[PDB]
Amino acid sequence: VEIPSSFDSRKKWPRCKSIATIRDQSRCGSCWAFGAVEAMSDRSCIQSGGKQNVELSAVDLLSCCESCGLGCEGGILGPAWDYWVKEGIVTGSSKENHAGCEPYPFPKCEHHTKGKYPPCGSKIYKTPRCKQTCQKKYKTPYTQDKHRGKSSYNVKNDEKAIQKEIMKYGPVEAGFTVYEDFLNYKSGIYKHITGETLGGHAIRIIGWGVENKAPYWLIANSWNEDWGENGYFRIVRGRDECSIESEVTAGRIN
Ligand SMILES: *[C@H](CC(=O)N1C(=O)C=C(OC)[C@@H]1CC(C)C)[C@H](C)NC(=O)[C@H](CC(C)C)NC(=O)[C@H](CC(C)C)OC(=O)[C@H]([C@@H](C)CC)N(C)C
Ligand code: NA
């Protein structure tokens, strides 16, 4: 297929409201689970023609997946997508909206940036317990609120392959190496210039563009709407910047 010079999943599939939703992982290293349930929510809606229009529970995946790593201390993408295929994930929104089966237990906080929420700080929550119970007001039993995928896969470490996957099947999850200067990001096209590694981060790629001849990926972060560009950031595209093209994972419902 011919790849357009820009693409925005929010513009292709505007009925799928999850695609334009920015979440907040709070005082928890649950980026791996947020990028997963966000892209899964998007792809569930896109690949079902808008029939499965849901917000999947970050806390269900975070608390119940035994193979996904260390919970709030960080996790692993492949096993998150396998969990969705095999066990599936219930619905659940933010602490503040408290919709769906299992809403997130942790409140919105600022991630090394200024704004209207309390600062996240340096102290981490304990990983929540796997409770397998829908909130009292939600009248579907937990097991019957599960949304499952059919397949999960890593995407080839090829710019055009990543672009074709996003354009055909929807937003993808992606890992990258976070350096200290990423914490100073306010706007524009990020590339690593200063600072030491802080480990890995997992995000959702929703599209791509070019500004002043500089190509970028358009990415949803899970640090609330005050961070970056109303919750989004852009990062150099085509040079495997911070390994952004090398840890892409996704999957399909059919
Ligand atoms: C989510 C990313 C994140 O929340 N943060 C940052 O990247 C930087 C931050 O603030 C300075 C925040 C909050 C932290 C201070 C806690 C999450 C921490 N990252 C991960 O889960 C990544 C995801 C991949 C796909 C990039 N993976 C890891 O951290 C892995 C997880 C284990 C289970 C393998 O852990 C490590 O890389 C590492 C070792 C266990 C490696 C043998 N540690 C735990 C950093
Ligand atoms: Na901002």
Side-chain angles (χ1 to χ4, degrees), residues 1-135 137-254:
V1 67
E2 194 183 325
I3 309 299
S5 78
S6 70
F7 182 83
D8 182 343
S9 294
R10 295 169 299 178
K11 306 300 176 280
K12 181 152 175 188
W13 301 285
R15 298 189 185 262
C16 295
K17 296 303 188 228
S18 60
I19 302 165
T21 296
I22 294 295
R23 296 196 195 200
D24 193 335
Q25 61 189 83
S26 192
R27 303 175 177 86
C28 180
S30 52
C31 59
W32 63 268
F34 275 74
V37 296
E38 290 163 11
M40 292 159 182
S41 302
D42 297 351
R43 284 179 163 246
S44 290
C45 180
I46 291 163
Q47 298 169 11
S48 75
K51 181 65 187 199
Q52 296 187 51
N53 204 326
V54 294
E55 188 171 0
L56 295 180
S57 178
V59 78
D60 188 31
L61 174 59
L62 168 63
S63 66
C64 295
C65 178
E66 303 156 33
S67 287
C68 286
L70 299 175
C72 285
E73 298 176 330
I76 314 166
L77 299 196
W81 288 77
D82 291 341
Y83 184 84
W84 175 65
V85 172
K86 183 177 176 172
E87 288 84 6
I89 304 167
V90 304
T91 65
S93 76
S94 67
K95 188 178 193 281
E96 290 79 8
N97 289 339
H98 56 82
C101 177
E102 281 181 344
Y104 203 54
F106 306 147
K108 290 176 199 164
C109 65
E110 300 303 353
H111 303 262
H112 302 284
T113 199
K114 297 181 195 138
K116 61 186 178 283
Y117 300 108
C120 295
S122 58
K123 275 185 172 314
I124 304 279
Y125 295 122
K126 302 197 203 98
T127 306
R129 295 179 297 107
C130 179
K131 294 192 182 182
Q132 306 159 307
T133 308
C134 296
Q135 68 167 309
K137 277 146 170 257
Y138 192 79
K139 301 313 217 207
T140 301
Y142 170 83
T143 61
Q144 307 305 296
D145 199 49
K146 283 287 196 178
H147 293 259
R148 286 176 177 83
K150 178 173 172 149
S151 69
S152 59
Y153 47 80
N154 297 334
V155 180
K156 188 184 196 226
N157 68 329
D158 176 66
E159 178 185 8
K160 188 183 165 99
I162 295 162
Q163 291 175 305
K164 283 164 61 188
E165 174 70 30
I166 290 161
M167 195 161 76
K168 185 159 189 191
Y169 296 119
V172 298
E173 194 173 17
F176 75 101
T177 298
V178 49
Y179 293 91
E180 290 169 294
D181 62 348
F182 186 74
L183 305 191
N184 308 316
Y185 177 88
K186 307 299 175 194
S187 64
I189 303 169
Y190 173 81
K191 79 177 168 183
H192 174 222
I193 296 174
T194 62
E196 294 314 333
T197 187
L198 301 175
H201 186 32
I203 48 58
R204 177 170 60 103
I205 315 182
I206 66 158
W208 66 84
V210 51
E211 198 158 305
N212 323 307
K213 313 190 202 184
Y216 63 79
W217 296 109
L218 176 58
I219 297 185
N221 198 2
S222 53
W223 292 355
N224 75 56
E225 74 278 4
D226 287 350
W227 187 87
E229 302 187 320
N230 214 234
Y232 302 84
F233 69 101
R234 288 176 284 167
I235 184 169
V236 173
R237 169 171 52 92
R239 290 190 194 169
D240 196 31
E241 184 66 28
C242 296
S243 295
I244 194 63
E245 285 140 24
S246 294
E247 191 176 15
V248 179
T249 297
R252 284 169 52 195
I253 68 175
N254 64 45

